Amino acid sequence: VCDSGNKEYMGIEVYVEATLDEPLRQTTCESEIHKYGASVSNGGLNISVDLLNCFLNFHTVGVYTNRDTVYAKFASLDPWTTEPMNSMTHDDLVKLTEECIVDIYLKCEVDKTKDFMKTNDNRLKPRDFKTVPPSNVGSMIELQSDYCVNDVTAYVKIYDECGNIKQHSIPTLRDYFTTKNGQPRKILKKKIDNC
Secondary structure (H helix, E strand, O other): OOOOOOOOEEEEEEEEEEEEOOOOOOOOOOEEOOOOEEEEEEEOEEEEEEEEEEOOOOEEEEEEEOOEEEEEEEEEEOOOOOOOOOOOOOHHHHHHHHEEEEEEEEEEOOOOOOOEEOOOOOOOHHHEEEEEEOOOOOOOOOEEEOOEEEEEEEEEEEOOOOOOOOOOOOOOOOEEEEEEOOOOOOOEEOOOOOO
């Protein structure tokens, strides 16, 4: 399956962390996946991600809320057993590395008629996060925020699914965006479930 070499098999993880201007209120949770994109509605925020000239599909959408912050993860899963499969031709991979845009849009949908949520979880500690390497490429993330968001952070990693079979894998593409100033490059490590 891995060279082969007719096609490349890539995976993607997009992480979004958004802190609102007040504690989160009680909401329902909806998520959807469509062609080259996905979105999640939870905690007063709709987070949408669409991939432009990346030729990759998401397979799962996870979301976690803690106090004033929504954490989302959009990711691919096993590339050979999951549909739709994330294989691309070599020209598509060239197009990706030259033109891929991870377009992220936050839209506030806070309903102040609902009570604040009571978080049963501990405050998050440096132990709940992992550091990530710095941005690899040229501003892959294009992120639009909204008025209820005090800070937002996004991270994308696009990687070779054959990286543990091949001796020389396609180099991972990564980008990191934040409105935070003076904070480490960190992402929630706690794995988070679907709605």
